[PDB]
Amino acid sequence: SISIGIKCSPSIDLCEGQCRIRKYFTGYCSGDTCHCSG
């Protein structure tokens, strides 16, 4: 994965949307930072 440096929480993980508008396929919150892949 890459990290995009958007803050997140795993409990309400909105990283997929942040990754998809940046043209990745998916994303997830690690610790408190969004990761993207694809």
Side-chain angles (χ1 to χ4, degrees):
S1 69
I2 69 150
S3 311
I4 57 173
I6 291 306
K7 195 166 171 68
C8 57
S9 163
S11 289
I12 175 53
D13 180 350
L14 307 176
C15 294
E16 185 180 88
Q18 293 287 346
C19 296
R20 291 187 165 179
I21 66 168
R22 292 171 171 84
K23 306 185 172 200
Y24 299 88
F25 179 63
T26 204
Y28 63 97
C29 192
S30 182
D32 76 342
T33 307
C34 289
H35 292 242
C36 308
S37 34

PDB file of all heavy atoms in Angstrom:
ATOM      1  N   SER A   1       0.858  -1.212   0.000  1.00  0.00           N
ATOM      2  CA  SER A   1       0.000   0.000   0.000  1.00  0.00           C
ATOM      3  C   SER A   1       0.888   1.254   0.000  1.00  0.00           C
ATOM      4  O   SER A   1       2.075   1.204   0.447  1.00  0.00           O
ATOM      5  CB  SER A   1      -0.935   0.022   1.245  1.00  0.00           C
ATOM      6  OG  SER A   1      -0.230   0.221   2.502  1.00  0.00           O
ATOM      7  N   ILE A   2       0.333   2.359  -0.517  1.00  0.00           N
ATOM      8  CA  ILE A   2       0.823   3.723  -0.166  1.00  0.00           C
ATOM      9  C   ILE A   2       0.026   4.301   0.990  1.00  0.00           C
ATOM     10  O   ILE A   2      -1.031   3.772   1.308  1.00  0.00           O
ATOM     11  CB  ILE A   2       0.781   4.650  -1.378  1.00  0.00           C
ATOM     12  CG1 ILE A   2      -0.668   4.965  -1.762  1.00  0.00           C
ATOM     13  CG2 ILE A   2       1.533   3.989  -2.519  1.00  0.00           C
ATOM     14  CD1 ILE A   2      -0.853   6.305  -2.382  1.00  0.00           C
ATOM     15  N   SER A   3       0.608   5.258   1.717  1.00  0.00           N
ATOM     16  CA  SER A   3      -0.124   6.084   2.691  1.00  0.00           C
ATOM     17  C   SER A   3      -0.361   7.433   2.076  1.00  0.00           C
ATOM     18  O   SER A   3       0.512   7.973   1.355  1.00  0.00           O
ATOM     19  CB  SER A   3       0.678   6.340   3.990  1.00  0.00           C
ATOM     20  OG  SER A   3       1.190   5.173   4.476  1.00  0.00           O
ATOM     21  N   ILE A   4      -1.539   7.977   2.302  1.00  0.00           N
ATOM     22  CA  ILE A   4      -1.869   9.313   1.812  1.00  0.00           C
ATOM     23  C   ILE A   4      -1.907  10.349   2.929  1.00  0.00           C
ATOM     24  O   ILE A   4      -2.202  11.489   2.672  1.00  0.00           O
ATOM     25  CB  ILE A   4      -3.184   9.350   1.024  1.00  0.00           C
ATOM     26  CG1 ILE A   4      -4.364   8.828   1.851  1.00  0.00           C
ATOM     27  CG2 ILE A   4      -3.039   8.550  -0.269  1.00  0.00           C
ATOM     28  CD1 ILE A   4      -5.681   9.008   1.144  1.00  0.00           C
ATOM     29  N   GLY A   5      -1.671   9.983   4.168  1.00  0.00           N
ATOM     30  CA  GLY A   5      -1.542  11.082   5.193  1.00  0.00           C
ATOM     31  C   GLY A   5      -2.859  11.837   5.509  1.00  0.00           C
ATOM     32  O   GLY A   5      -2.852  12.971   5.987  1.00  0.00           O
ATOM     33  N   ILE A   6      -3.986  11.200   5.225  1.00  0.00           N
ATOM     34  CA  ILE A   6      -5.319  11.625   5.683  1.00  0.00           C
ATOM     35  C   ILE A   6      -5.509  10.867   7.006  1.00  0.00           C
ATOM     36  O   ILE A   6      -5.212   9.670   7.102  1.00  0.00           O
ATOM     37  CB  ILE A   6      -6.427  11.213   4.663  1.00  0.00           C
ATOM     38  CG1 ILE A   6      -6.296  12.035   3.374  1.00  0.00           C
ATOM     39  CG2 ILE A   6      -7.839  11.406   5.205  1.00  0.00           C
ATOM     40  CD1 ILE A   6      -6.286  13.543   3.581  1.00  0.00           C
ATOM     41  N   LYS A   7      -5.978  11.571   8.011  1.00  0.00           N
ATOM     42  CA  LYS A   7      -6.274  10.994   9.322  1.00  0.00           C
ATOM     43  C   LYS A   7      -7.590  10.260   9.276  1.00  0.00           C
ATOM     44  O   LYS A   7      -8.557  10.710   8.643  1.00  0.00           O
ATOM     45  CB  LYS A   7      -6.339  12.105  10.358  1.00  0.00           C
ATOM     46  CG  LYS A   7      -6.288  11.621  11.788  1.00  0.00           C
ATOM     47  CD  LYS A   7      -6.004  12.752  12.742  1.00  0.00           C
ATOM     48  CE  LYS A   7      -6.170  12.318  14.193  1.00  0.00           C
ATOM     49  NZ  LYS A   7      -5.121  11.347  14.567  1.00  0.00           N
ATOM     50  N   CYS A   8      -7.633   9.162  10.006  1.00  0.00           N
ATOM     51  CA  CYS A   8      -8.768   8.234  10.010  1.00  0.00           C
ATOM     52  C   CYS A   8      -8.868   7.500  11.349  1.00  0.00           C
ATOM     53  O   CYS A   8      -7.947   7.522  12.157  1.00  0.00           O
ATOM     54  CB  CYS A   8      -8.646   7.218   8.880  1.00  0.00           C
ATOM     55  SG  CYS A   8      -7.108   6.278   8.922  1.00  0.00           S
ATOM     56  N   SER A   9      -9.986   6.817  11.533  1.00  0.00           N
ATOM     57  CA  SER A   9     -10.153   5.861  12.640  1.00  0.00           C
ATOM     58  C   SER A   9     -10.650   4.544  12.060  1.00  0.00           C
ATOM     59  O   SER A   9     -11.612   4.529  11.300  1.00  0.00           O
ATOM     60  CB  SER A   9     -11.178   6.388  13.655  1.00  0.00           C
ATOM     61  OG  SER A   9     -11.645   5.342  14.525  1.00  0.00           O
ATOM     62  N   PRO A  10     -10.063   3.410  12.504  1.00  0.00           N
ATOM     63  CA  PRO A  10     -10.602   2.138  12.108  1.00  0.00           C
ATOM     64  C   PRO A  10     -12.051   1.901  12.454  1.00  0.00           C
ATOM     65  O   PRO A  10     -12.724   1.124  11.749  1.00  0.00           O
ATOM     66  CB  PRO A  10      -9.699   1.141  12.844  1.00  0.00           C
ATOM     67  CG  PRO A  10      -8.393   1.838  12.895  1.00  0.00           C
ATOM     68  CD  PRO A  10      -8.821   3.227  13.281  1.00  0.00           C
ATOM     69  N   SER A  11     -12.548   2.591  13.474  1.00  0.00           N
ATOM     70  CA  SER A  11     -13.914   2.399  13.932  1.00  0.00           C
ATOM     71  C   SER A  11     -14.966   3.032  13.025  1.00  0.00           C
ATOM     72  O   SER A  11     -16.162   2.666  13.093  1.00  0.00           O
ATOM     73  CB  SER A  11     -14.064   2.908  15.384  1.00  0.00           C
ATOM     74  OG  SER A  11     -13.381   2.020  16.266  1.00  0.00           O
ATOM     75  N   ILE A  12     -14.548   3.992  12.218  1.00  0.00           N
ATOM     76  CA  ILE A  12     -15.376   4.606  11.213  1.00  0.00           C
ATOM     77  C   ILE A  12     -14.477   4.935  10.018  1.00  0.00           C
ATOM     78  O   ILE A  12     -14.124   6.069   9.739  1.00  0.00           O
ATOM     79  CB  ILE A  12     -16.223   5.793  11.761  1.00  0.00           C
ATOM     80  CG1 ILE A  12     -17.014   6.512  10.661  1.00  0.00           C
ATOM     81  CG2 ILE A  12     -15.371   6.774  12.542  1.00  0.00           C
ATOM     82  CD1 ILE A  12     -17.863   5.601   9.831  1.00  0.00           C
ATOM     83  N   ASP A  13     -14.091   3.871   9.335  1.00  0.00           N
ATOM     84  CA  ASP A  13     -13.008   3.904   8.355  1.00  0.00           C
ATOM     85  C   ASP A  13     -13.548   4.346   7.020  1.00  0.00           C
ATOM     86  O   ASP A  13     -14.216   3.571   6.284  1.00  0.00           O
ATOM     87  CB  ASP A  13     -12.335   2.539   8.283  1.00  0.00           C
ATOM     88  CG  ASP A  13     -11.193   2.458   7.292  1.00  0.00           C
ATOM     89  OD1 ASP A  13     -10.974   3.401   6.457  1.00  0.00           O
ATOM     90  OD2 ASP A  13     -10.475   1.399   7.366  1.00  0.00           O
ATOM     91  N   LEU A  14     -13.228   5.603   6.693  1.00  0.00           N
ATOM     92  CA  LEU A  14     -13.623   6.211   5.422  1.00  0.00           C
ATOM     93  C   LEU A  14     -12.473   6.390   4.392  1.00  0.00           C
ATOM     94  O   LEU A  14     -12.566   7.208   3.448  1.00  0.00           O
ATOM     95  CB  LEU A  14     -14.308   7.550   5.698  1.00  0.00           C
ATOM     96  CG  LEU A  14     -15.481   7.501   6.687  1.00  0.00           C
ATOM     97  CD1 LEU A  14     -16.029   8.910   6.959  1.00  0.00           C
ATOM     98  CD2 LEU A  14     -16.599   6.582   6.224  1.00  0.00           C
ATOM     99  N   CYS A  15     -11.465   5.550   4.503  1.00  0.00           N
ATOM    100  CA  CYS A  15     -10.278   5.636   3.647  1.00  0.00           C
ATOM    101  C   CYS A  15     -10.542   5.157   2.212  1.00  0.00           C
ATOM    102  O   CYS A  15      -9.964   5.704   1.277  1.00  0.00           O
ATOM    103  CB  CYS A  15      -9.148   4.854   4.244  1.00  0.00           C
ATOM    104  SG  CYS A  15      -8.533   5.533   5.802  1.00  0.00           S
ATOM    105  N   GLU A  16     -11.416   4.152   2.033  1.00  0.00           N
ATOM    106  CA  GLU A  16     -11.714   3.673   0.663  1.00  0.00           C
ATOM    107  C   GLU A  16     -12.151   4.812  -0.268  1.00  0.00           C
ATOM    108  O   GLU A  16     -11.629   4.959  -1.387  1.00  0.00           O
ATOM    109  CB  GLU A  16     -12.782   2.575   0.678  1.00  0.00           C
ATOM    110  CG  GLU A  16     -13.030   1.977  -0.711  1.00  0.00           C
ATOM    111  CD  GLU A  16     -14.058   0.896  -0.748  1.00  0.00           C
ATOM    112  OE1 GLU A  16     -15.252   1.221  -0.917  1.00  0.00           O
ATOM    113  OE2 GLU A  16     -13.661  -0.292  -0.600  1.00  0.00           O
ATOM    114  N   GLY A  17     -13.069   5.640   0.191  1.00  0.00           N
ATOM    115  CA  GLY A  17     -13.545   6.799  -0.615  1.00  0.00           C
ATOM    116  C   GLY A  17     -12.424   7.798  -0.927  1.00  0.00           C
ATOM    117  O   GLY A  17     -12.287   8.274  -2.063  1.00  0.00           O
ATOM    118  N   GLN A  18     -11.560   8.036   0.069  1.00  0.00           N
ATOM    119  CA  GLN A  18     -10.426   8.945  -0.097  1.00  0.00           C
ATOM    120  C   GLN A  18      -9.458   8.390  -1.117  1.00  0.00           C
ATOM    121  O   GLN A  18      -8.903   9.125  -1.888  1.00  0.00           O
ATOM    122  CB  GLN A  18      -9.701   9.195   1.217  1.00  0.00           C
ATOM    123  CG  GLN A  18     -10.526   9.954   2.231  1.00  0.00           C
ATOM    124  CD  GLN A  18     -10.695  11.428   1.887  1.00  0.00           C
ATOM    125  OE1 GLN A  18     -10.009  11.992   1.033  1.00  0.00           O
ATOM    126  NE2 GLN A  18     -11.605  12.061   2.579  1.00  0.00           N
ATOM    127  N   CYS A  19      -9.235   7.084  -1.080  1.00  0.00           N
ATOM    128  CA  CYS A  19      -8.347   6.409  -2.033  1.00  0.00           C
ATOM    129  C   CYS A  19      -8.952   6.377  -3.448  1.00  0.00           C
ATOM    130  O   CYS A  19      -8.232   6.591  -4.418  1.00  0.00           O
ATOM    131  CB  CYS A  19      -8.045   4.998  -1.538  1.00  0.00           C
ATOM    132  SG  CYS A  19      -7.122   5.036   0.020  1.00  0.00           S
ATOM    133  N   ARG A  20     -10.258   6.113  -3.554  1.00  0.00           N
ATOM    134  CA  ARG A  20     -10.905   5.955  -4.851  1.00  0.00           C
ATOM    135  C   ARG A  20     -10.952   7.269  -5.607  1.00  0.00           C
ATOM    136  O   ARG A  20     -10.720   7.255  -6.806  1.00  0.00           O
ATOM    137  CB  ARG A  20     -12.288   5.316  -4.749  1.00  0.00           C
ATOM    138  CG  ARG A  20     -12.231   3.857  -4.332  1.00  0.00           C
ATOM    139  CD  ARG A  20     -13.567   3.187  -4.385  1.00  0.00           C
ATOM    140  NE  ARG A  20     -13.365   1.744  -4.328  1.00  0.00           N
ATOM    141  CZ  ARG A  20     -14.342   0.836  -4.334  1.00  0.00           C
ATOM    142  NH1 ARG A  20     -15.598   1.202  -4.370  1.00  0.00           N
ATOM    143  NH2 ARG A  20     -14.043  -0.470  -4.275  1.00  0.00           N
ATOM    144  N   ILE A  21     -11.157   8.389  -4.931  1.00  0.00           N
ATOM    145  CA  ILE A  21     -11.153   9.726  -5.671  1.00  0.00           C
ATOM    146  C   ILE A  21      -9.737  10.085  -6.128  1.00  0.00           C
ATOM    147  O   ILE A  21      -9.567  10.797  -7.127  1.00  0.00           O
ATOM    148  CB  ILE A  21     -11.813  10.887  -4.897  1.00  0.00           C
ATOM    149  CG1 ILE A  21     -11.047  11.270  -3.635  1.00  0.00           C
ATOM    150  CG2 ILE A  21     -13.279  10.582  -4.615  1.00  0.00           C
ATOM    151  CD1 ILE A  21     -11.511  12.579  -3.019  1.00  0.00           C
ATOM    152  N   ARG A  22      -8.727   9.462  -5.485  1.00  0.00           N
ATOM    153  CA  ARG A  22      -7.311   9.572  -5.890  1.00  0.00           C
ATOM    154  C   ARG A  22      -6.888   8.463  -6.838  1.00  0.00           C
ATOM    155  O   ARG A  22      -5.680   8.259  -7.105  1.00  0.00           O
ATOM    156  CB  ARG A  22      -6.425   9.582  -4.646  1.00  0.00           C
ATOM    157  CG  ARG A  22      -6.598  10.835  -3.835  1.00  0.00           C
ATOM    158  CD  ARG A  22      -5.874  10.671  -2.530  1.00  0.00           C
ATOM    159  NE  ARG A  22      -5.804  11.895  -1.753  1.00  0.00           N
ATOM    160  CZ  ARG A  22      -6.751  12.360  -0.935  1.00  0.00           C
ATOM    161  NH1 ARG A  22      -7.957  11.755  -0.795  1.00  0.00           N
ATOM    162  NH2 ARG A  22      -6.486  13.473  -0.254  1.00  0.00           N
ATOM    163  N   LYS A  23      -7.874   7.738  -7.368  1.00  0.00           N
ATOM    164  CA  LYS A  23      -7.696   6.728  -8.387  1.00  0.00           C
ATOM    165  C   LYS A  23      -7.026   5.453  -7.918  1.00  0.00           C
ATOM    166  O   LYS A  23      -6.409   4.777  -8.725  1.00  0.00           O
ATOM    167  CB  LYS A  23      -6.988   7.311  -9.665  1.00  0.00           C
ATOM    168  CG  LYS A  23      -7.688   8.545 -10.238  1.00  0.00           C
ATOM    169  CD  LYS A  23      -7.085   9.030 -11.542  1.00  0.00           C
ATOM    170  CE  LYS A  23      -7.925  10.139 -12.162  1.00  0.00           C
ATOM    171  NZ  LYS A  23      -7.598  10.232 -13.613  1.00  0.00           N
ATOM    172  N   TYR A  24      -7.135   5.103  -6.623  1.00  0.00           N
ATOM    173  CA  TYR A  24      -6.829   3.761  -6.165  1.00  0.00           C
ATOM    174  C   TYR A  24      -8.125   2.975  -6.069  1.00  0.00           C
ATOM    175  O   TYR A  24      -9.216   3.558  -6.111  1.00  0.00           O
ATOM    176  CB  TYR A  24      -6.082   3.782  -4.822  1.00  0.00           C
ATOM    177  CG  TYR A  24      -4.769   4.508  -4.939  1.00  0.00           C
ATOM    178  CD1 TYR A  24      -4.722   5.886  -4.753  1.00  0.00           C
ATOM    179  CD2 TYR A  24      -3.593   3.842  -5.272  1.00  0.00           C
ATOM    180  CE1 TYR A  24      -3.550   6.591  -4.895  1.00  0.00           C
ATOM    181  CE2 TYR A  24      -2.393   4.544  -5.426  1.00  0.00           C
ATOM    182  CZ  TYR A  24      -2.401   5.933  -5.250  1.00  0.00           C
ATOM    183  OH  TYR A  24      -1.262   6.703  -5.341  1.00  0.00           O
ATOM    184  N   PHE A  25      -8.041   1.660  -5.991  1.00  0.00           N
ATOM    185  CA  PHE A  25      -9.247   0.850  -5.931  1.00  0.00           C
ATOM    186  C   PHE A  25      -9.736   0.714  -4.510  1.00  0.00           C
ATOM    187  O   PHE A  25     -10.936   0.598  -4.276  1.00  0.00           O
ATOM    188  CB  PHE A  25      -9.015  -0.562  -6.467  1.00  0.00           C
ATOM    189  CG  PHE A  25     -10.231  -1.414  -6.404  1.00  0.00           C
ATOM    190  CD1 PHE A  25     -11.358  -1.066  -7.136  1.00  0.00           C
ATOM    191  CD2 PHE A  25     -10.295  -2.499  -5.549  1.00  0.00           C
ATOM    192  CE1 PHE A  25     -12.510  -1.843  -7.062  1.00  0.00           C
ATOM    193  CE2 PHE A  25     -11.431  -3.278  -5.489  1.00  0.00           C
ATOM    194  CZ  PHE A  25     -12.541  -2.931  -6.236  1.00  0.00           C
ATOM    195  N   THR A  26      -8.812   0.563  -3.565  1.00  0.00           N
ATOM    196  CA  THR A  26      -9.256   0.441  -2.208  1.00  0.00           C
ATOM    197  C   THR A  26      -8.335   1.043  -1.198  1.00  0.00           C
ATOM    198  O   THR A  26      -7.269   1.536  -1.539  1.00  0.00           O
ATOM    199  CB  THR A  26      -9.667  -0.991  -1.852  1.00  0.00           C
ATOM    200  OG1 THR A  26     -10.592  -0.949  -0.728  1.00  0.00           O
ATOM    201  CG2 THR A  26      -8.413  -1.888  -1.622  1.00  0.00           C
ATOM    202  N   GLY A  27      -8.831   1.126   0.024  1.00  0.00           N
ATOM    203  CA  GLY A  27      -8.083   1.794   1.103  1.00  0.00           C
ATOM    204  C   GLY A  27      -8.598   1.359   2.455  1.00  0.00           C
ATOM    205  O   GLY A  27      -9.689   0.802   2.536  1.00  0.00           O
ATOM    206  N   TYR A  28      -7.811   1.617   3.493  1.00  0.00           N
ATOM    207  CA  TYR A  28      -8.162   1.232   4.855  1.00  0.00           C
ATOM    208  C   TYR A  28      -7.330   2.098   5.809  1.00  0.00           C
ATOM    209  O   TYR A  28      -6.291   2.637   5.432  1.00  0.00           O
ATOM    210  CB  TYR A  28      -7.845  -0.248   5.115  1.00  0.00           C
ATOM    211  CG  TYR A  28      -6.373  -0.558   4.991  1.00  0.00           C
ATOM    212  CD1 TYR A  28      -5.536  -0.613   6.094  1.00  0.00           C
ATOM    213  CD2 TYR A  28      -5.800  -0.748   3.733  1.00  0.00           C
ATOM    214  CE1 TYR A  28      -4.155  -0.878   5.942  1.00  0.00           C
ATOM    215  CE2 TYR A  28      -4.444  -1.019   3.579  1.00  0.00           C
ATOM    216  CZ  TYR A  28      -3.632  -1.069   4.662  1.00  0.00           C
ATOM    217  OH  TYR A  28      -2.275  -1.366   4.445  1.00  0.00           O
ATOM    218  N   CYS A  29      -7.835   2.228   7.011  1.00  0.00           N
ATOM    219  CA  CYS A  29      -7.205   2.959   8.064  1.00  0.00           C
ATOM    220  C   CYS A  29      -6.273   1.981   8.792  1.00  0.00           C
ATOM    221  O   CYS A  29      -6.712   0.996   9.374  1.00  0.00           O
ATOM    222  CB  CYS A  29      -8.234   3.508   9.023  1.00  0.00           C
ATOM    223  SG  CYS A  29      -7.534   4.712  10.162  1.00  0.00           S
ATOM    224  N   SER A  30      -4.833   2.578   8.806  1.00  0.00           N
ATOM    225  CA  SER A  30      -3.879   1.866   9.645  1.00  0.00           C
ATOM    226  C   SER A  30      -3.375   2.764  10.727  1.00  0.00           C
ATOM    227  O   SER A  30      -2.730   3.759  10.435  1.00  0.00           O
ATOM    228  CB  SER A  30      -2.730   1.326   8.836  1.00  0.00           C
ATOM    229  OG  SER A  30      -1.867   0.596   9.697  1.00  0.00           O
ATOM    230  N   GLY A  31      -3.640   2.375  11.978  1.00  0.00           N
ATOM    231  CA  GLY A  31      -3.406   3.219  13.134  1.00  0.00           C
ATOM    232  C   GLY A  31      -4.330   4.426  13.065  1.00  0.00           C
ATOM    233  O   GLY A  31      -5.497   4.366  13.483  1.00  0.00           O
ATOM    234  N   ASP A  32      -3.813   5.522  12.520  1.00  0.00           N
ATOM    235  CA  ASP A  32      -4.662   6.679  12.281  1.00  0.00           C
ATOM    236  C   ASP A  32      -4.412   7.358  10.950  1.00  0.00           C
ATOM    237  O   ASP A  32      -4.760   8.498  10.810  1.00  0.00           O
ATOM    238  CB  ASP A  32      -4.570   7.692  13.447  1.00  0.00           C
ATOM    239  CG  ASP A  32      -3.280   8.521  13.434  1.00  0.00           C
ATOM    240  OD1 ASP A  32      -2.281   8.150  12.765  1.00  0.00           O
ATOM    241  OD2 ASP A  32      -3.282   9.594  14.084  1.00  0.00           O
ATOM    242  N   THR A  33      -3.903   6.614   9.961  1.00  0.00           N
ATOM    243  CA  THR A  33      -3.583   7.157   8.660  1.00  0.00           C
ATOM    244  C   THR A  33      -4.164   6.283   7.573  1.00  0.00           C
ATOM    245  O   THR A  33      -4.112   5.041   7.696  1.00  0.00           O
ATOM    246  CB  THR A  33      -2.056   7.180   8.476  1.00  0.00           C
ATOM    247  OG1 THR A  33      -1.478   7.866   9.601  1.00  0.00           O
ATOM    248  CG2 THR A  33      -1.687   7.901   7.209  1.00  0.00           C
ATOM    249  N   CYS A  34      -4.754   6.906   6.535  1.00  0.00           N
ATOM    250  CA  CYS A  34      -5.262   6.131   5.364  1.00  0.00           C
ATOM    251  C   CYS A  34      -4.140   5.559   4.480  1.00  0.00           C
ATOM    252  O   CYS A  34      -3.193   6.295   4.066  1.00  0.00           O
ATOM    253  CB  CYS A  34      -6.188   6.970   4.504  1.00  0.00           C
ATOM    254  SG  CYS A  34      -7.786   7.334   5.250  1.00  0.00           S
ATOM    255  N   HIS A  35      -4.280   4.262   4.204  1.00  0.00           N
ATOM    256  CA  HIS A  35      -3.498   3.563   3.176  1.00  0.00           C
ATOM    257  C   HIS A  35      -4.374   3.250   1.983  1.00  0.00           C
ATOM    258  O   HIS A  35      -5.596   3.048   2.136  1.00  0.00           O
ATOM    259  CB  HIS A  35      -2.940   2.271   3.765  1.00  0.00           C
ATOM    260  CG  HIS A  35      -1.909   2.507   4.811  1.00  0.00           C
ATOM    261  ND1 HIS A  35      -0.605   2.085   4.683  1.00  0.00           N
ATOM    262  CD2 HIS A  35      -1.966   3.222   5.963  1.00  0.00           C
ATOM    263  CE1 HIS A  35       0.087   2.467   5.743  1.00  0.00           C
ATOM    264  NE2 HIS A  35      -0.715   3.170   6.535  1.00  0.00           N
ATOM    265  N   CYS A  36      -3.763   3.222   0.792  1.00  0.00           N
ATOM    266  CA  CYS A  36      -4.495   2.900  -0.449  1.00  0.00           C
ATOM    267  C   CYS A  36      -3.737   1.832  -1.208  1.00  0.00           C
ATOM    268  O   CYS A  36      -2.516   1.726  -1.079  1.00  0.00           O
ATOM    269  CB  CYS A  36      -4.620   4.136  -1.357  1.00  0.00           C
ATOM    270  SG  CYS A  36      -5.283   5.609  -0.579  1.00  0.00           S
ATOM    271  N   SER A  37      -4.443   1.008  -1.972  1.00  0.00           N
ATOM    272  CA  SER A  37      -3.750   0.141  -2.939  1.00  0.00           C
ATOM    273  C   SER A  37      -4.570  -0.035  -4.188  1.00  0.00           C
ATOM    274  O   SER A  37      -5.789   0.238  -4.177  1.00  0.00           O
ATOM    275  CB  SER A  37      -3.425  -1.218  -2.323  1.00  0.00           C
ATOM    276  OG  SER A  37      -4.421  -1.625  -1.413  1.00  0.00           O
ATOM    277  N   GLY A  38      -3.940  -0.539  -5.248  1.00  0.00           N
ATOM    278  CA  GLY A  38      -4.668  -0.752  -6.494  1.00  0.00           C
ATOM    279  C   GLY A  38      -4.946   0.589  -7.160  1.00  0.00           C
ATOM    280  O   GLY A  38      -5.967   0.770  -7.837  1.00  0.00           O
TER     281      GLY A  38
END
